[PDB]
RNA sequence: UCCAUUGCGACAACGAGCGAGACCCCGGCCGCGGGCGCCGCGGGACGGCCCGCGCGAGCGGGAGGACGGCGGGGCGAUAGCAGGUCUGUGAUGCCCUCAGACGCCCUGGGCCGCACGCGCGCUACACUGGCGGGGCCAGCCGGCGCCCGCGAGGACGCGCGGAGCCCCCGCCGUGGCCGGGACCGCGGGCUGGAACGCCCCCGCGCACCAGGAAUGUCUUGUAGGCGCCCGCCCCCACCGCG
């Protein structure tokens, strides 16, 4: 319920839906170190600190 | 004697104007001096429709005529009435390069 | 009215000749069509722009922009020396930036110790790079399809 | 010198001084005129003449050896014409008032002629500078 | 200026020339509410009458109000020129006057009558309501 | 330090640190000079605007409508006025207020079209920090603009009010309202 | 629609406006216009009076806008 | 792989050519020379250096540098369209007109007329503003004095010369109001053989509160905003090239 902030460690390309989204791998530096995949809009880069409203969603 | 004469030469192409320059400087070192003044380039501009009828995309021509001018007024008293002739006939006779002499 | 490249400016015949020879240094700034010429010598800290001090330049808000290098480097050097700038070309702001560039470059040339010159370069460029290196971009030409360089005339299909 | 003081305070201070000291006087036609075809209404202050006079004398001092004609001054007091559903265009100011001002100045020897136009005279430099220094404090 | 408080004689709404005028507006822009008076003609009239111009019209004491009337019926005497008037070189008496309300409407009506019986181009056009000057019709100017 | 670039020669820039970590590295505060004016050609690379001092980023957004394009000195003046007003009301350094607003303003979630299927099929996604700061600035400016139009009050007071309310987290402002709107239309689509 | 006066009708100046303003820390012409529903010019005049008296002081000035601070506390 | 049939590497194909690039003009940095007036000749940048990859061609990042990876323009392949132009011409085939002329020259009128549908533009809908006063800087390039007149303009006489936005101080105070300036009524001038044309002054003071279904253009000195010159021209620019 409480949003958590994740870090980026790998970007794996855009989508074909007009090329606005970018798939991104992140890791919970809070201690869990879970390497998952999400969908992000806008310019991203390594070591960015995303903010997540869900601790249990996926993408692919 | 001394007649404050001035040399003006005009041309549309930049390659002879510089060649004429060198010949004159070569041939006027003795009869005094002859250092040049390079003027701002007078560029004539004409814009025209590329079409004789006015059809299709409005497309334009851009012509121009650059005119280059150099001015040796360095003779001055260093040239007499006949002395100006000497060099002016010893310099090459390039087909096109207007020249006028005035005191 | 003024043209920047005029011989009457680059040599600064404005100054009288016996005084024209006391000025050792020479310097240049520019931005767009603006050009500034500085004649630096030895004195006790005085600066002038078109026969006007630095405190009374006209846009008012940018006075800090022209005083920048002083409060950066420090007033010791400038207090040591005295300057007389003259600028001519398009625009108030362009003139401002050209002037500050000339200030900085000239004070750089006053020092003879190259090592200090390099140290000052590092000290100053870090804060900004256009204080030494001229900005290159310049106004670009227009085309006949419309009333702008890249904009076009509106097209009506039906 | 005069250029070492901001133009704003000099102009108005000197105008007050001029008006006190009877050097110039506003003629009669001032009561109902604009200062240019570009304008639209008349000035709101009653002492605009002396402001113009001071700005002019300052202009003449700045130039120095050079010479200024009347119209050349009038191109420094131009503006923009609006209200014509047509693109705006710049227009020149008036010349009768400028002419009156220079004539009044010249009758006092503050201003001297030449081959063309007029230019400042040494007395003008004296008074302008002394007033400027006086207000420097 | 420096008039903060309403003077004891403040008059909240003025009536003059059958028109009504408010006392919160500055004087020279309120008179513009009359038909025949504008900005240029007003500044000139008041000034000759020794009246302040940057004043709210409600502080206009009747003593200053009457002298103003005396200057709008005989203005030429009071020094005002003749290029500043509404009606220069009248068609009949050849004189010059300034015409205020009521006079304008009557005057405008009689010219058209003059135009009509004389059989001009303008008169015939006025009566079908067309452009009088040469400004082009046809294009634009449609519902 | 030796030269503390006090902004407008009044309020310093030494104790101003963002709280949120996510967007901290996308807010420059150590470099501001004394004037929000710098002819630098930012926006040439893909991430260089991340260095532009935030106040300059704000001013560049106050001259947007075509009536007001190319007018930066007016904007600098406007910002100075607003900052005086803020320090007057709140009592504290305005720059902190501004960063706090740009933080609390800015969405954390958004919806886009990727699911196709012949309909909206929108998918909830996450939002990058740079976009967050850009949107926060844009919303501040836009909300101030909409208030001052055909209203007696001036642009600067509207600006200050919007900044203060957004920094307080209050939903009276336009920025917070837009943030909430986007968040709900998204979470609905998650 | 709304109308506001340009001249204060006598006791109105002091029975409120002077009182009201004196209990304000910061102020501007437009705020006071919108607050007690009078035009801006009167605000200008009044604030002139007050800075003359001394209650308020200038912190920022400009043709488009100046703002005051209450020095009475 | 490349913006590119731009290249690598193969193959019943081998070997060539055009187009593309190269090339020409402009600009930015440095040098030499000359110099009434800034203008003539050259150097400089090449995916060259470092790091990653890739057999290879080549891709991503960092430098140092005036400039970093097609900076803006010109030229523009084969083949073709029943595209436009016989009203640009001593360019023209076949027709029609050819002494009451469709030849040529004169006087007037018209091409502009207006219940209506739409295409490119201009001006505004206001306080991020309008009015009044003052200060100040451009470039393609460039002409001025004195005296009358409110002004627009005019009489004389000589060769000399640059603005809007913006900035500072004040007034107005959300009112179709001092926003906007169409229409109309008296008057003064310019061009010209000739005003129906164009400028200036006083008064009157139309629509218009950011615009439905629909739709156009744009990536750095760019959009947008602000003005200034030439062309056609007796006078006149909301157009066009810059």
Residue identified by tokens 């200026």 is: E1
Q: D77 with D36: CB under 8 angstroms? A: yes
In a domain, C1, yes or no: no
User: Phi, psi (5° rounding) for residue C117?
Assistant: -60, -45
Nearest chain E CA: its distance from G25 CA (Å): 23
Please name the helix (run of DSSP H) or strand (run of DSSP E) that holds residue D112, with its range, or none.
strand D111-112
Residue identified by tokens 């056009």 is: E125
Q: A51 with A33: CB under 8 angstroms? A: no
DSSP string, F121-145: -EEEEEE-HHHHHHHHHHHHHHHHH
Nearest chain A CA: its distance from F128 CA (Å): 6
Range of the domain at E59: 9-81
Question: CA-CA distance, G69 to G73, in Å (whole number)?
Answer: 10
Mark residue E141 as left, alpha or beta (left: phi above 0; alpha: psi -120 to 50; beta: remaining): left
Question: Taking CA atoms, what residue in B is nearest to C146?
Answer: B58
User: CA separation (Å) from B74 to B8, F15, F59?
Assistant: 11, 72, 60
Q: D55 with D11: CB under 8 angstroms? A: yes
Looking at residue C58, what DSSP letter applies? S
Question: Taking CA atoms, what residue in G is nearest to F89?
Answer: G26
- Angle separating helix axes C92-110 and C114-125, nearest 10 degrees: 150
Listed in sequence order, the residues at least 6 apart from C12 whose beta carbon sits closer than 8 Å to its beta carbon are C20, C37, C39, C86
User: Phi, psi (5° rounding) for residue D57?
Assistant: -60, -40
Range of the domain at B34: 4-99
Within 8 A of C144 by CB-CB distance, chain B residues are 58-60
Buried b (16+ CB within 10 A) or exposed e, C33-66: bbbbbbbbeeeeeebebeeeebeebeeeebbebb
Q: B72 with B6: CB under 8 angstroms? A: yes
Question: CA-CA distance, A12 to A59, in Å (whole number)?
Answer: 12
Choosing from E81, E99, E120, the residue where a domain stops is E81
Please name the helix (run of DSSP H) or strand (run of DSSP E) that holds residue E106, with its range, or none.
helix E103-118
In a domain, E59, yes or no: yes
Q: A46 with A8: CB under 8 angstroms? A: yes
Please name the helix (run of DSSP H) or strand (run of DSSP E) that holds residue C42, with its range, or none.
strand C34-42
Cα-Cα-Cα-Cα dihedral sign, residues F31, F37, F39, F44: positive
Range of the domain at A42: 2-60
Contact G30 F89 (CB under 8 A): no
The 8 Å CB, 24+ separation contacts for C62-67 are: C62/C93, C62/C96, C62/F35, C62/F37, C64/F9, C64/F33, C64/F34, C64/F35, C65/C96, C65/C97, C65/C100, C65/F35, C65/F37, C66/C96, C66/C99, C66/C100, C66/C103
Tokens of D26: 């506003």
Listed in sequence order, the residues at least 6 apart from E52 whose beta carbon sits closer than 8 Å to its beta carbon are E27, E46
In a domain, C55, yes or no: yes
Q: A37 with A23: CB under 8 angstroms? A: yes
Question: CA-CA distance, F127 to F107, in Å (whole number)?
Answer: 7
Tokens of F90: 């709140």
Cα-Cα-Cα-Cα dihedral sign, residues G44, G50, G51, G52: positive
User: Phi, psi (5° rounding) for residue D112?
Assistant: -130, 155
Contact G6 E6 (CB under 8 A): no
Number of domains observed in the structure of chain E: 2
Closest CA to B4 of B93, B84, B87: B84
Tokens of E73: 């019926």
Closest CA to H118 C1' — which residue?
C158
The experimental technique behind this entry is: cryo-EM
What residues of A are in the F interface, CB distance below 8 Å? Answer: 3, 5, 15, 17, 20-21, 38-45, 48-54, 57
Number of domains observed in the structure of chain B: 1
Tokens of E18: 């059958």
Residue C56 near chain F (CB below 8 Å): no
Residue D6 near chain C (CB below 8 Å): yes
User: Phi, psi (5° rounding) for residue C73?
Assistant: -60, -40
In a domain, C9, yes or no: no
Contact F85 G26 (CB under 8 A): yes
Residue C125 near chain F (CB below 8 Å): no
Contact E4 G46 (CB under 8 A): yes
Question: CA-CA distance, D30 to E103, in Å (whole number)?
Answer: 31
Question: CA-CA distance, G35 to G31, in Å (whole number)?
Answer: 6
Question: CA-CA distance, D7 to E34, in Å (whole number)?
Answer: 43
Cα-Cα-Cα-Cα dihedral sign, residues F27, F32, F36, F39: negative
Question: CA-CA distance, E27 to E36, in Å (whole number)?
Answer: 16
Does D have 3 or more CB contacts under 8 Å with E?
yes
Q: Degrees (nearest 5) of the Cα angle F36, F137, A7?
A: 110
- Of the partner residues E4, E23, E25, the one whose CB lies closest to the CB of residue G45: E4
Residue C132 near chain D (CB below 8 Å): no
User: CA separation (Å) from F176 to B23, C10, E95, F143?
Assistant: 81, 58, 72, 10
The 8 Å CB, 24+ separation contacts for F17-20 are: F18/F99, F18/F103, F19/F100, F19/F103, F20/F103
User: Phi, psi (5° rounding) for residue C62?
Assistant: -95, 5
Would you call B47 exposed, middle or buried from its count of C-beta atoms within 10 A (0-12, 13-18, 19+)?
A: exposed
Contact F108 A3 (CB under 8 A): yes
Within 8 A of E6 by CB-CB distance, chain G residues are 7-10
Residue C144 near chain B (CB below 8 Å): yes
Within 8 A of A20 by CB-CB distance, chain F residues are 112
Number of domains observed in the structure of chain A: 1
Question: CA-CA distance, F82 to G60, in Å (whole number)?
Answer: 11
Contact F152 G34 (CB under 8 A): yes
Helix (H, G, I), strand (E, B) or coil at F96: helix
Cα-Cα-Cα-Cα dihedral sign, residues D59, D61, D63, D68: positive
- Entry resolution (Å): 2.9
In a domain, C10, yes or no: no
Question: CA-CA distance, A41 to F123, in Å (whole number)?
Answer: 11
Beta strand pairing call for E19-22 and E13-16: antiparallel
User: Can you give the C-alpha Rg of chain E in angstroms?
Assistant: 20
In a domain, E3, yes or no: no
Shortest CA to C1' contact from B69: nucleotide = H39
Number of domains observed in the structure of chain C: 1
Shortest CA to C1' contact from F153: nucleotide = H127
Would you call E104 exposed, middle or buried from its count of C-beta atoms within 10 A (0-12, 13-18, 19+)?
A: middle
Question: CA-CA distance, C28 to C38, in Å (whole number)?
Answer: 7
Closest CA to H136 C1' — which residue?
C58
Looking at residue E16, what DSSP letter applies? E
Within 8 A of F33 by CB-CB distance, chain C residues are 64, 68
User: CA separation (Å) from G28 to C5, C124, E128, F162, G46?
Assistant: 50, 42, 57, 18, 11
In a domain, C78, yes or no: yes
Question: CA-CA distance, B94 to B89, in Å (whole number)?
Answer: 11
DSSP string, G46-57: HHHHHHHHTSEE
Range of the domain at C101: 24-158
Residue spans of alpha helices (H) in E2-61: 27-30, 39-48
Residue identified by tokens 């102020």 is: G27
Question: CA-CA distance, C118 to D94, in Å (whole number)?
Answer: 58
Nucleotides of H under 7 A from a protein CB: 27-29, 33-41, 66-67, 72-74, 83-85, 88, 112-124, 126-142, 144-153, 157-158, 160-175, 177-178, 180-188, 196-198, 200-205, 209-210, 215-228, 237-242
Tokens of F53: 């001092």
User: CA separation (Å) from C53 to C158, D58, F127, F136, G5?
Assistant: 62, 18, 52, 42, 48
Helix (H, G, I), strand (E, B) or coil at B7: strand
Within 8 A of A3 by CB-CB distance, chain F residues are 108
Listed in sequence order, the residues at least 6 apart from G20 whose beta carbon sits closer than 8 Å to its beta carbon are G35, G36
CA D71 to C1' H130, whole Å: 29
Residue identified by tokens 């005497």 is: E77
Residue identified by tokens 């059989």 is: E119
In a domain, C100, yes or no: yes
Contact G6 E10 (CB under 8 A): no
């Amino acid at each position: 319920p409480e949003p958590i902030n994740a870090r980026v460690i790998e970007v794996l390309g855009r989508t074909s839906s007009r090329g606005g989204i970018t798939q991104v791998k992140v890791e919970f530096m809070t201690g869990e170190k879970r390497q998952i995949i999400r969908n992000v809009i806008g310019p991203v880069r390594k070591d960015d600190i995303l903010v997540l409203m869900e601790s249990e969603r996926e993408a692919r | 004697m001394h007649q404050k004469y001035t040399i003006i030469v005009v041309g549309k192409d930049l390659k002879l104007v510089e060649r004429y320059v060198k010949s004159i400087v070569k041939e006027g070192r003795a009869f005094g001096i002859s250092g040049p003044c390079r003027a701002p380039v007078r560029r004539l501009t004409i814009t025209t429709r590329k079409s004789p009828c006015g059809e299709g995309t409005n497309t334009w021509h851009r012509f121009e005529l650059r005119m280059y001018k150099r001015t040796f007024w360095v003779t001055c008293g260093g040239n007499d009435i006949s002395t100006i002739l000497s060099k002016t006939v010893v310099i090459p006779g390039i087909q096109v390069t207007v020249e006028v002499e005035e005191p | 009215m003024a043209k920047g490249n005029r011989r009457d400016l680059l040599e600064r015949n404005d100054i009288e000749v016996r005084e024209r020879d006391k000025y050792t240094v020479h310097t240049l700034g520019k931005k767009k069509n603006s050009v500034a010429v500085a004649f630096v010598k030895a004195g006790k800290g005085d600066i002038l722009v078109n026969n006007v001090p630095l405190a009374l330049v006209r846009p008012e808000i940018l006075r800090t922009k022209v005083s920048e290098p002083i409060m950066i480097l420090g007033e010791s050097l400038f207090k040591g020396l005295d300057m007389n700038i003259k600028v001519a070309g398009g625009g108030h702001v362009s003139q401002i930036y050209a002037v500050r560039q000339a200030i900085s470059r000239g004070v750089l040339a006053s020092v003879k110790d190259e090592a200090a010159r390099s140290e000052l370069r590092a000290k100053l460029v870090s804060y900004d790079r256009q204080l030494v290196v001229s900005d290159p971009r310049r106004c670009e030409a227009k085309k006949f399809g419309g009333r702008g360089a890249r904009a076009r005339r509106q097209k009506s299909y039906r | 010198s005069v250029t070492r003081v901001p133009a704003d305070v000099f102009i108005n201070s000197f105008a007050a001084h001029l008006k006190n000291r009877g050097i110039i006087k506003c003629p009669a036609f001032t009561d109902y005129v604009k200062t240019g075809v570009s304008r639209q209404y008349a000035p709101r202050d009653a002492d605009w003449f002396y402001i113009k006079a001071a700005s002019v004398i300052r202009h003449f001092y700045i130039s120095g050896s050079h010479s200024i004609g009347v119209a050349g001054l009038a191109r420094k007091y131009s503006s923009l014409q609006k209200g014509k559903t047509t693109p705006h265009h710049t227009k020149r100011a008036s010349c009768k008032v400028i002419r009156s001002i220079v004539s009044q100045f010249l009758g006092q020897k503050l201003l001297i002629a030449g081959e063309r136009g007029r230019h400042i005279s040494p007395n003008g430099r004296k008074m302008v500078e002394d007033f400027a220094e006086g207000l420097q404090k | 200026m420096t008039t903060i408080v309403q003077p004891n004689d403040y008059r909240d709404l003025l009536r003059m020339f059958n028109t009504n005028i408010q006392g919160k507006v500055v004087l020279e822009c309120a008179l513009v509410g009359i038909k025949g008076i504008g900005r240029r003609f007003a500044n000139v009239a008041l000034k000759k009458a020794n009246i302040d111009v940057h004043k709210r019209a409600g502080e206009l004491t009747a003593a200053e109000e009457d002298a103003l009337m005396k200057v709008l019926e005989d203005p030429l005497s009071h020094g005002i020129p003749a290029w500043m008037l509404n009606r220069n070189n009248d068609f009949e008496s050849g004189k010059d006057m300034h015409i205020l309300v009521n006079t304008i409407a009557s005057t405008h009506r009689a010219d058209l009558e003059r135009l009509r019986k004389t059989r001009c181009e303008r008169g015939v056009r006025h009566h079908h309501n067309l452009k009088v000057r040469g400004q082009h019709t046809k294009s634009t100017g449609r519902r | 330090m030796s030269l503390e670039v006090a902004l407008f020669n009044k309020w310093p820039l030494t104790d101003v640190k963002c709280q949120d970590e996510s967007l901290e590295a996308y807010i420059s505060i150590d470099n501001h000079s004394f004037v929000p004016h710098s002819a630098g050609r930012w926006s040439a690379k893909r991430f260089r605007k991340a260095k532009c001092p935030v106040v300059e980023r704000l001013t560049n957004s106050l001259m947007m409508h075509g009536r007001n394009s190319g007018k930066k000195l007016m904007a600098m003046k406007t910002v100075g006025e607003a900052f005086e007003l803020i320090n007057l009301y709140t009592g504290k350094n305005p720059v902190q207020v501004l960063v706090d607003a740009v933080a609390n303003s800015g969405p954390r979630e958004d919806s886009c079209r990727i699911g196709k299927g012949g309909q909206v099929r929108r998918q909830s996604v996450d939002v990058s920090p740079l976009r967050r700061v850009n949107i926060g600035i844009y919303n501040i400016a836009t909300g101030a603009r909409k208030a001052a139009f055909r209203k007696v009050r001036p642009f600067a007071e509207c600006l200050a009010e919007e900044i203060m309310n957004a920094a307080a987290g209050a939903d009276k402002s336009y920025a917070i309202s837009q943030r909430n709107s986007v968040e709900r239309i998204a979470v609905s689509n998650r | 629609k709304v109308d506001y006066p340009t001249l204060f009708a006598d006791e109105a100046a002091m029975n409120e406006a002077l009182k009201f303003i004196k209990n304000s820390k910061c102020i501007t012409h437009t705020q006071i216009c919108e607050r007690l529903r009078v035009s801006v010019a009167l605000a200008k005049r009044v604030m002139r009076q007050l800075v003359k008296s001394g209650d308020f002081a200038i912190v920022s000035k400009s043709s488009r806008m100046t703002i005051f601070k209450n020095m009475t506390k």
